[PDB]
Amino acid sequence: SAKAVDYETEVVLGNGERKKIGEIVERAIEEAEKNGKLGRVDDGFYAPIDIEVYSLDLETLKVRKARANIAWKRTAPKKMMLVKTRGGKRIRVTPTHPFFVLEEGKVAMRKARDLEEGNKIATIEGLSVSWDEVAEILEYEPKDPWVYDLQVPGYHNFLANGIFVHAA
């Protein structure tokens, strides 16, 4: 099953205005369709990209610019989850998409469908990294039949919708 996010999740770029992940991915897919670099998996596609994102270092909690190098487009699952935090962040993800959760001094990863209210996830507040309690998780059936992801070597996350979203 796909670990991925909704089209409209807005990725913070290190060197321009923030952009919907669906736009980033579909442009990369369209170009790779024509130059022979398109990759195919049973439930979707990958294509090369070269963009600058912001990533959290989970050991030091520093935010660093980092490069993302693969764009992923996958069939949406039958159900999706809207995750809302107390600090105001909202994101729509697949049910198995993992989040960094800080629990009793350690960070572990937890699937969206396994999150409970009060679980603290990694976010930005203004310009500060913040561990932010989940407020509610709500299942919905998607209208958009595609979901999206990026690969970020080393870090496996990128800042989007004010959340450090786990990545390929």
Numbering used by the authors: -2 to 165
How does the study describe this entry?
Protein splicing is catalyzed by intervening protein sequences termed inteins. As the first step toward understanding the spread and evolution of inteins and cross-talks within the “inteinome”, we determined the crystal structures of mini-inteins inserted at the same insertion site within the putative cell division control protein 21 (Cdc21) from the hyperthermophilic archaea, Pyrococcus abyssi and Pyrococcus horikoshii OT3. The cell division control protein 21 (Cdc21), belonging to the MCM (mini-chromosome maintenance) protein family, is one of the proteins invaded by several inteins. The structure of the PabCDC21-1 intein revealed the HINT fold characteristic for inteins from thermophilic organisms.
The PabCDC21-1 intein is inserted at the presumable P-loop ATP/GTP-binding motif; while, the PabCDC21-2 intein locates 27 residues downstream of the PabCDC21-1 intein insertion site. Indeed, we could obtain diffracting crystals of a variant of the PabCDC21-1 intein carrying mutations at the N- and C-terminal catalytic residues (C1A, and N164A) together with three N- and one C-extein residue (Ser-Ala-Lys and Ala, respectively). We solved the three-dimensional structure of PabCDC21-1 intein at 1.60-Å resolution by molecular replacement. The presence of N- and C-extein residues due to the active site mutations allowed us to analyze the conformation of the PabCDC21-1 intein by measuring the distance between the N-scissile peptide and the side chain of the +1 residue (Cα atom of Ala). A large distance of about 8 Å suggests an open conformation as it has been observed in most intein structures containing extein residues. PabCDC21-1 has an improved C2-symmetry interface with the loop regions at the C35 and N35 sites with hydrophobic residues L53, L58, and V60 for the N-terminal, and I121, L124, and V126 for the C-terminal subdomain (the C35 and N35 numbering for the split sites is based on the NpuDnaE intein as described in Aranko et al. (2014a) for convenience). The structure of the PabCDC21-1 intein revealed extensive hydrophobic interactions between the C2-symmetry-related N35 and C35 loops, increasing the subdomain interactions at the elevated temperature optimal for the growth of Pyrococcus abyssi. The crystal structures of the PabCDC21-1 and PhoCDC21-1 inteins showed that both mini-inteins do not have large flexible loop insertions at the HEN insertion site, unlike the MjaTFIIB intein.
